[PDB]
Every structure is written in C-alpha cells, then in structure tokens.
C-alpha cells in the first residue's frame, strides 16, 4: 500500500514498484 499499483494488498505497490 505504498507505491503505484501492484503487490501489497490490492491498493498500491509494495514500495519497490
């Protein structure tokens, strides 16, 4: 839930997008 879109829940990327 920290970057663009991708891993980490279904919201925002896992930082290292």
């Amino acid at each position: 839930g920290g970057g663009g879109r991708g891993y980490e829940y279904n919201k925002q990327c896992l930082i290292f997008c």
Side-chain angles (χ1 to χ4, degrees), residues 2-14:
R5 270 94 72 179
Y7 261 87
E8 193 261 123
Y9 234 99
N10 70 287
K11 293 291 185 180
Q12 278 117 267
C13 246
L14 188 54

